[PDB]
């Protein structure tokens, strides 16, 4: 009978948030407001890097906080040099169509895919010289999304079909398949100590993972949207994300609750990434009206905007050193920050 | 170091040559959106002009042209649309025959969608009316669908072939008139729309023609000629 | 989190009147375009009809015109569609269903399955 298992499902829907509600006494603005908020950080583009043919969609800083990857998509993946303003590398997809990129904790080993529901792997220190395909992933139904890497052996991926898995790319196997979302899945990220992940989805939700066990542990549905980008905070006890409905919100993984709400009387608009500075105080989103906006984590306030764009931003990342920022955007050219 | 340096620059330079190359080829080829229901006869159509997305090219007249099929992709299309959004031209197909379901008002539903998109805007459509001989071998009732057919006469400005059904005829208009009403009712960005008849391998030469019109006003528009 | 609701079905004999309702929470409901998708038996889903963000515009199915009246009030955020003069082909499990994103005019996969801001749908006998 359905009725019945209707019934039971939202009475203990209920439970769930009434307990959540119980276990909560105030927000965080309301205890970190002693603090001395930081003053207002003023930003400047040190360098602009230049020769994607149109509307670079992804990137991904480098462990070494120097070199980063990034793609368009013409099909082109890049490697830049910070601190030389230069390229290293470039790979042509057999595929036109890009949506993500990773970069290996290691710099051994780089990752992209798109619409063809294939993701490829790519051994940039082959012996025999140049850059060859290391391995070739497949088995989602929809569009992969986006992925990381664990660590040079284990890649974890997301797609549009409600489905995300867990690659060993020696055995090129879907080592397990995680399962209960309702919708798309959007953007993931992996924890620093990289025993727990998380994923956005489009059901205004999101859910944490157990990348050894494999089921979901709890969700979290605060946004009233679908979820579009997601990122974990410097330490693995709290994470934030943002939606489609011009908000972003953080949360944290030991309360199971949300902690805060960042959102603005004159935006219209939604968010295409975030990310953190290495002490977690300075919060970094980008937005559809071709500029970046940066907040006090803790304080819940606007503290500078990046306006160096002039088409979508769609890709954003902060280097592991915490020494500089670098944005991507629907134009050819892409911006970097410190 | 100097050496290293040099190294770096030098291997710039020459990913900056191998890359013009390939830019020159991309620039020049236009890249066309095939769209539409999964049974409104697109196997045909694709048959007249020749792993989630299927790609074909072909070539007309010295002008690359690359076809991109949603084919095995999600239901769900809100997202990845939004993805395609450079494409030069969008090529609609829509079975005017219309079943399991009412599917010439999905099919208007979804067309109203895509032209109102805010980032599909600056991307025209091509409409073709495809299964028309069909659409008049089963005619020869439209009435429940639309209470309007009985009442809509054929435009004066009309061009029926001969031998063709006056019923087949006002039919055809009708549901022509629909969706150029449902386009022109916005009339606001580049985008435009440019409905044609088919059963009929000179689609391609169709398409051709329209796309070199989509680009021709484009640059007028930018000069602000037009 | 985004949840729905609908109510008012039941048996209504040809020739009767009947009002389907739908309310809403957890979302600004103002700023949200609207839609109302049916499934008949043994067939797929059809959409219906739908209006505006403030009600101003408003389309129907050929099926349904002139029979059909939907109505809103973002004041206590639910949707309400009345329906007259029901005949048996009318039978079908109809669906409020939301747009993805707010502040626009489009609406993508509002009659696609597995959409996940639809309702569980309400059922109508004649």
């Known amino acids: 009978e359905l009725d019945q298992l209707r019934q039971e499902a939202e009475q203990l829907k209920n439970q769930i948030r009434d307990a959540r509600k119980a276990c909560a006494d105030a927000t965080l603005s309301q205890i970190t407001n002693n603090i001395d908020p930081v003053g207002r950080i003023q930003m400047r583009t040190r360098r602009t890097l230049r020769g994607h043919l149109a509307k670079i969609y992804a990137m991904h800083w480098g462990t070494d906080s120097r070199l980063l990857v990034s793609a368009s998509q013409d099909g082109k993946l890049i490697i830049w040099d910070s601190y030389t303003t230069n390229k290293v590398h470039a790979i042509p997809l057999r595929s036109s169509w890009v949506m993500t990129c990773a970069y290996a904790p290691s710099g051994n080993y780089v990752a992209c895919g798109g619409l063809d529901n294939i993701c490829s792997i790519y051994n940039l220190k082959t012996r025999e010289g140049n850059v060859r395909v290391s391995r070739e992933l497949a088995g989602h139904t929809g569009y992969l999304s986006c992925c990381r890497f664990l660590d040079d052996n284990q890649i974890v991926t997301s797609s549009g079909d409600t489905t995300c898995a867990l690659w060993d790319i020696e055995t090129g196997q879907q080592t397990t398949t995680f399962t209960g979302h309702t919708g798309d899945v959007m953007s993931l990220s992996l924890a620093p100590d990289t025993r727990l992940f998380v994923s956005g989805a489009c059901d205004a939700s999101a859910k944490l993972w157990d990348v050894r066990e494999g089921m979901c542990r709890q969700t979290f549905t605060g946004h009233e949207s679908d979820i579009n980008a997601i990122c974990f905070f410097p330490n693995g006890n709290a994470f934030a994300t943002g939606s489609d409905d011009a908000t972003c919100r953080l949360f944290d993984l030991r309360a199971d609750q949300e902690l805060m709400t960042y959102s603005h009387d004159n935006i219209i608009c939604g968010i295409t990434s975030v990310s953190f500075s290495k002490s977690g105080r300075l919060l970094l989103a980008g937005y559809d009206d071709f500029n970046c906006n940066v907040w006090d984590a803790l304080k819940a306030d606007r503290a500078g905007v990046l306006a160096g764009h002039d088409n979508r931003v769609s890709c954003l990342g902060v280097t592991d050193d915490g020494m500089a920022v670098a944005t991507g955007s629907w134009d050819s050219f892409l911006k970097i920050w410190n | 170091q100097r050496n290293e340096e040099k190294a770096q620059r030098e291997a710039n330079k020459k990913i900056e040559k191998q890359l013009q190359k390939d830019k020159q080829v991309y620039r020049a080829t236009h890249r066309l959106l095939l769209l539409g229901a999964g049974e409104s006869g697109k196997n045909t159509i694709v048959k007249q002009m020749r792993s989630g997305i299927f790609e074909t090219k072909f070539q007309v007249d010295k002008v690359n042209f690359h076809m991109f099929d949603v084919g095995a992709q999600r239901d769900e299309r809100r997202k990845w649309i939004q993805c395609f959004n450079d494409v030069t031209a969008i090529i609609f197909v829509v079975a005017s025959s219309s079943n399991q379901t009412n599917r010439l008002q999905a099919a208007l539903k979804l067309f109203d969608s895509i032209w109102n998109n805010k980032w599909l805007r600056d991307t025209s459509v091509i409409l073709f009316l495809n299964k028309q001989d069909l659409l008049a071998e089963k005619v020869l009732k439209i009435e429940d669908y639309f209470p309007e057919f009985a009442r809509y006469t054929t435009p004066e400005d009309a061009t029926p072939e001969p031998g063709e059904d006056p019923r087949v005829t006002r039919a055809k208009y009708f549901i022509r008139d629909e969706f150029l009403r449902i386009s022109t009712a916005s009339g606001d960005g580049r985008h435009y729309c440019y409905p044609h008849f088919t059963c009929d391998t000179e689609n391609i030469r169709r398409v051709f023609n329209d796309c070199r019109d989509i680009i021709q006003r484009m640059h007028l528009r930018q000069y602000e000629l037009l | 989190q985004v949840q729905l609701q609908e109510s008012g079905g039941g048996l209504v004999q040809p020739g009767g009147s009947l009002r389907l309702s739908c309310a809403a929470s957890?979302?600004?409901?103002?700023?949200?375009?609207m839609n109302w998708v049916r499934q008949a038996p043994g067939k797929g889903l059809e959409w219906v009809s739908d209006?505006?963000?403030?009600?101003?515009?408003?389309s129907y199915t050929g099926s349904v015109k002139g029979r059909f009246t939907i109505s809103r009030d973002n004041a206590k955020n639910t949707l309400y569609l009345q329906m007259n003069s029901l005949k048996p082909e009318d039978t079908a499990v109809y669906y409020c269903?939301?747009?993805?994103?707010?502040?626009?005019?489009?609406?993508?996969?509002?009659?696609?399955?597995?959409?996940?801001?639809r309702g569980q749908g309400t059922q109508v006998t004649v």
């Open positions: 209006i505006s963000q403030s009600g101003a515009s408003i």
């Open positions: 957890g979302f600004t409901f103002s700023n949200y375009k």
């Open positions: 269903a939301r747009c993805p994103a707010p502040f626009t005019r489009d609406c993508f996969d509002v009659t696609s399955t597995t959409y996940a801001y």
